[PDB]
Amino acid sequence: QVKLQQSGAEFVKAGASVKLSCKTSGYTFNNYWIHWVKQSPGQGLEWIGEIDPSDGYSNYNQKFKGKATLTVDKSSSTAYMHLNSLTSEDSAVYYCTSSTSVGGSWGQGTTVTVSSASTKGPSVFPLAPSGGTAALGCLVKDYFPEPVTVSWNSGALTSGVHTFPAVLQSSGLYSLSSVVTVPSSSLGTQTYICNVNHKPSNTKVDKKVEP
Amino acid sequence: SDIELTQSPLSLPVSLGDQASISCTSSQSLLHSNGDTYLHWYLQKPGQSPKLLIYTLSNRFSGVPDRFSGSGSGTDFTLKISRVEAADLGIYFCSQTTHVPYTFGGGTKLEIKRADAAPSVFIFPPSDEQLKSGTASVVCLLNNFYPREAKVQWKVDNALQSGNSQESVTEQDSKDSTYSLSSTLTLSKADYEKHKVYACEVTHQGLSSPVTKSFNR
């Protein structure tokens, strides 16, 4: 029954605004309050504010008063949150939540990424191998936005693969590694290729990795 | 200011089928004037939204397994999980909605315990392709280790490198319960070509003492 369907990811620049939405169903929209929550690496989980759709009354975490604005639209059973004058401190996942009495489920979250950076494909560099088990990989460098995907030998190779989370470099571009450990004695017998894909730029690269 | 909720422990290793106990302390009384105590417990799985397990102290949310139980009062609260299973792994948060502004604890990670495993360490020089293009990334891989805590230290001709490296860590392995970590050291092409000994030193509980992997260019 109860569902909170939030809007998709947002990539916007500093000073810009965004408006997030949370379409509800499976309960009487007008009879329960709606809350928004921020989740960020820097501050963890924070309650932003609450709104009563019945009369539009709202109540804020003083920290977000003015920055966040809560509104509803009854016709569509949708709640909104407007964020203004965005800084990189506003880069976070934002959740919308129902009253506990209707279940108190949360929407799936909407990710807001505040950046200047423009879309850009990665360069792919080999992490070549050099007793018993060897390691090798690909460095997938200087792309925006997330995600990139990496597989090994067209999905055929999965055992011992670790694809690390991306890090945001001070340049405002991302970088990550994907590694695999293979048996030492296969090197020069067995070919290894990382299959890299960055859909936002349409950058697809298959990179062979060797001694 | 805001009510602070302090969780303990920060990380709780357990074995499947074990009992787990997580606590949450409040800087103020969470007893409301209506008699209720608005202290709630959530589980967040990786890449998912927080899920409510227990609300207002001990009310078990409809469809949440009875293995989860919430107790305590005033300012001291405990979540108990009687026979931990795969589905229960993730970060547990307490929160309070007694006093505006509503606040959240910092979370307690529930993870799988295993025997110490020393990381397998590998260093990778920058590729000639990358150097062509004007940057040098040096990569140090720490592979399949437990516990999570590991210190990586980059040294360039014995100069301790500080603030020019970045680490990334994988989620705990679904099969073998280990972690892996990569650390990337970034230099200019010019600076990389000024030095010889690139060295990654790894300190880990699973090792007799710090291992070093180096290469000379």
Numbering used by the authors:
A (entry chain H): 1 to 52, 52A, 53 to 82, 82A, 82B, 82C, 83 to 99, 101 to 127, ...
B (entry chain L): 0 to 27, 27A, 27B, 27C, 27D, 27E, 28 to 211
The authors write:
Human osteocalcin (bone Gla protein, BGP) is a useful biomarker for bone formation and bone-related diseases. The anti-osteocalcin C-terminal peptide antibody KTM219 is a representative Fab fragment applicable to the Q-body immunoassay. Q-body is a fluoro-labeled antibody, single-chain variable region (scFv) or antigen-binding fragment (Fab), and its fluorescence intensity increases when its antigen is added. In this study, to reveal the recognition mechanism of the KTM219 antibody and to discuss the structural basis for Q-body, we solved the crystal structures of Fab of the anti-osteocalcin antibody KTM219 and its complex with the antigen osteocalcin C-terminal peptide (BGP-C7).
To elucidate the mechanism of Q-body, we tried to crystalize Cys-tagged KTM219 Fab (Cys-containing peptide tag (MSKQIEVNYCSNETG) was added to N-terminus of VH) chemically modified with TAMRA-C5-maleimide (Biotium, Hayward, CA, USA) using thiol target labeling. However, we did not obtain crystals suitable for structural analysis. Therefore, we grew the KTM219 Fab crystal in the presence of free TAMRA fluorophore. The crystal belongs to the orthorhombic space group P21221, with unit cell constants of a = 66.19 Å, b = 69.52 Å, and c = 96.65 Å and contains one Fab antibody fragment per asymmetric unit. Although the overall structure is almost the same with/without the addition of TAMRA, the CDR-H1 and CDR-H3 loops of VH near the binding pocket have different conformations. However, we did not find the electron density assigned to TAMRA. A detailed comparison of the structure with the addition of TAMRA and the structure complexed with the antigen shows that the CDR-H3 loop has different conformations, although the overall structure is almost identical. In addition, the CDR-H1 structure with the addition of TAMRA has a partial helix, which partly resembles a helical conformation of CDR-H1 in the antibody–antigen complex. These findings suggest that TAMRA does not tightly bind to the specific site on the antibody and that weak interactions with TAMRA may affect the structural conformations of the CDR loops of the antibody around the antigen-binding pocket. In addition, in the structural analysis of the KTM219 Fab crystal grown in the presence of TAMRA, the electron density assigned to TAMRA could not be found, suggesting weak and dynamic interactions between the antibody and TAMRA.
